[PDB]
């Protein structure tokens, strides 16, 4: 039942984001209300999380493949739908496996950003 409900919620959110894309392209993201903004952000994160590198795609991509489990996927998607990962950077879900890898990539991105900002301030 958890799998079914998560799938249905994901489909509804993606459909709503697809519908709202047209308004975004006509009136701008600012015109949308806060609820629509949250839905848009969550939908983009879901879209980027659905991406998954393959162990046979090393030559095409240049990165190690990932194997994900059904329970891990369901739990991660449920958390994302509930909003447990709103503060996470959007790009962290791109070309990754589970939520653990997502958090590791977010940590790496934060560390690199802090180092780059420190260098810029030093300049």
């Amino acid at each position: 039942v958890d799998h079914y409900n998560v799938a249905q919620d994901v489909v509804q959110m993606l459909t709503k984001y697809r519908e709202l894309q047209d308004i975004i392209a006509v009136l701008g993201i600012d015109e949308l209300s806060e609820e629509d903004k949250l839905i848009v952000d969550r939908a983009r994160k879901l879209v980027k999380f659905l991406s998954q590198p393959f162990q046979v795609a090393e030559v095409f991509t240049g990165m190690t493949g990932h194997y994900v489990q059904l329970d891990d996927t369901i739990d991660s998607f449920s958390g994302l739908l509930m909003g447990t990962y709103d503060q996470v950077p959007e790009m962290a879900f791109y070309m990754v496996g589970g939520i653990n890898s997502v958090l590791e990539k977010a940590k790496k991105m934060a560390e690199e950003a802090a180092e780059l900002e420190k260098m810029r301030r030093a300049r």
């Binding site: 990962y85 503060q87 653990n100 958090l103 590791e104 940590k107 934060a110 950003a113 802090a114 900002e117």
Partner: peptide, 30 residues
């Protein structure tokens, strides 16, 4: 008052989330 009187993968994920949030806050502070 009576209720007060009476009385690891998730933990790892929570720790990682806390660490990432702390890193974001630290870079904001910087």
């Amino acid at each position: 008052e009576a209720a007060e009187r009476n009385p690891t993968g998730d933990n790892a994920r929570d720790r990682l989330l806390k660490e990432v949030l702390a890193l974001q806050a630290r870079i904001n502070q910087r």
